[PDB]
């Protein structure tokens, strides 16, 4: 039809770029504890946390760069090129032949990580408005159908990534398991460039973030006859009202982003089931599959909550408010952190006496004789926390904000999620110093047995609990 081709191109680019991002995040921890990189578990977790935090901090900046200048389609194109350039560094590092030419060489992998983070951030910020204005003209129902397709594309890309790419990286090889995400980024860039002919490109109107920055840099508030209009001032006031909810959600984002950086690290030191029983170097169950499981869990209860729980509660009343749902989600993620700490304490008690070796990936881990499935609850808890906090958070942020601040509220949501990831990385670094010594050692290849992830998880749970009590107090006082 000449228009559904543009929507299909947007969906394909979205699927490929989510697939590559999740392929990187699923086994970056395993890769950084590898032959080229004999990093500590704390260092690998910090690197992955910083990477995710960058991917979510660049969303407001990517959106501003797309809206104030450079357009949106061209911004996504340059972001995809930058993202592919960053992706290229990973298979080269994995391959022994090319790692020598590239380079230990921590600067190379840090450059690749920051490049990939900027690309993912800009694409994440700009793709959703791009798809919307691709489909806005037909009508709100067409937009709803396209966004159903977009949601399914995102989830499908994440699922296929966390399954296939993680299995290939952990079991088959890291070179192929990192070239496949690079290949899919290449195809995403190619398909976006090809669909540039059929895309509906809008001129840069100007992001609301520059207006907010001008308001904060003053000429309540000033408003009226001064050099600023009333609606922008009211909108910035609404954003300021929204901000404390995200400030409260920051520790939730820390503990949530722990699911793929330190939870995978703890998985590497549990008895991972072996699912091949055939051929040399028998394949083990990918540590990222748990995350995939959790994602699958979301797919099985996002519609349920949208079709069974929410309508029944709406009919019967007693439906919790957005703030109450956020509090429930923070309680659930606190429970996940506490369960992770309990499991890690039991793991450290067990591994002190006996151990089992696990040559998962390409490095041998002194895992405890504890089943990996004992880590299933905490992961599931985080998933529940998601459907109770993240959505609700944004939902509340959408309730107390005007329609004009669409994609500016969402940008702030991503920014504060990235801030939570950065806070988690900084907390891990702080507890890794000699004064505290929870993660202070010289144990290469991760080898968390000498560290204390139980103390780190307990600290995260305590911070989440303090934040939850403060949130409950302020919600009761205000509402």
């Amino acid at each position: 039809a000449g228009r559904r081709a543009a929507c299909g191109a947007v969906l394909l680019t979205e699927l490929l770029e989510r697939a590559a991002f999740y392929g990187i995040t699923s086994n970056l921890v395993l890769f950084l504890n590898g032959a080229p990189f004999c990093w500590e578990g704390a260092q690998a977790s910090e690197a992955l946390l910083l990477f995710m935090g960058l991917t979510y901090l660049g969303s407001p900046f990517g959106g501003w760069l797309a809206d104030a200048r450079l357009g949106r389609a061209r911004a996504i194109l340059l972001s995809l090129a930058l993202y592919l350039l960053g992706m290229l560094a990973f298979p080269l590092l994995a391959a022994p032949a090319t790692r020598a030419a590239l380079c230990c060489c921590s600067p190379a992998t840090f450059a690749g990580l920051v490049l990939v983070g900027l690309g993912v951030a800009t694409v994440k910020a700009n793709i959703t408005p791009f798809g919307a204005d691709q489909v806005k003209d037909r009508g709100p129902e067409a937009t709803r159908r396209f966004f159903n397709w977009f949601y399914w594309s995102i989830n499908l890309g994440a699922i296929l990534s966390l399954g296939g790419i993680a299995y290939i990286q952990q079991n088959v090889s890291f070179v192929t398991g990192y070239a496949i995400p690079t290949v899919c980024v290449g195809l995403a860039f190619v398909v976006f460039l090809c669909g540039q002919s059929v895309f509906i490109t809008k001129p840069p109107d100007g992001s609301a973030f520059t207006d907010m920055f001008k308001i904060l840099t003053y000429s309540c508030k000033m408003s009226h006859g001064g050099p600023f209009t009333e609606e922008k001032v009211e909108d910035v006031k609404a954003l300021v009202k929204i901000v404390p909810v995200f400030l409260a959600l920051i520790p939730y984002w820390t503990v949530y982003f722990q699911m793929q950086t330190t939870y995978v690290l703890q998985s590497l030191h549990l008895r991972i089931p072996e699912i091949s029983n055939i051929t040399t170097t028998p394949h083990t169950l990918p540590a990222a599959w748990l995350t995939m499981f959790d994602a699958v869990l979301i797919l099985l209860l996002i519609p349920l909550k949208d079709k069974l729980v929410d309508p029944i509660l709406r009919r019967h009343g007693l439906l919790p408010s957005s703030l109450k749902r956020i509090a429930v989600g923070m309680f659930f993620v606190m429970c996940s952190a506490f369960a992770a700490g309990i499991l890690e304490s039991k793991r450290l008690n067990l591994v002190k006496e006996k151990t089992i070796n696990q040559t998962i990936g390409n490095v041998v881990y002194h895992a405890a004789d504890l089943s990996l499935w004992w880590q299933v609850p905490q992961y599931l808890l985080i998933g529940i926390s998601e459907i109770f906090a993240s959505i609700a958070g944004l939902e509340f942020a959408y309730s107390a904000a005007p329609k004009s601040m669409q994609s500016a509220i969402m940008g702030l949501f991503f920014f504060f999620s990235g801030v939570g990831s950065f806070v988690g990385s900084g907390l891990l670094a702080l507890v890794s110093i000699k004064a505290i010594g929870w993660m202070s050692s010289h144990t290469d290849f991760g080898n968390i047995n000498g560290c204390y992830l139980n103390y780190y998880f307990f600290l995260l749970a305590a911070i989440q609990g303090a934040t939850l009590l403060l949130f409950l107090i302020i919600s009761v006082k205000y509402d």
Partner: peptide, 19 residues
């Protein structure tokens, strides 16, 4: 962010006031 798909089109499938 496992719920990026649902957060991307949050204002479409369910009905919210203001936005």
């Amino acid at each position: 962010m496992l719920s990026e798909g649902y957060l991307s089109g949050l204002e479409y499938w369910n009905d919210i006031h203001w936005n």
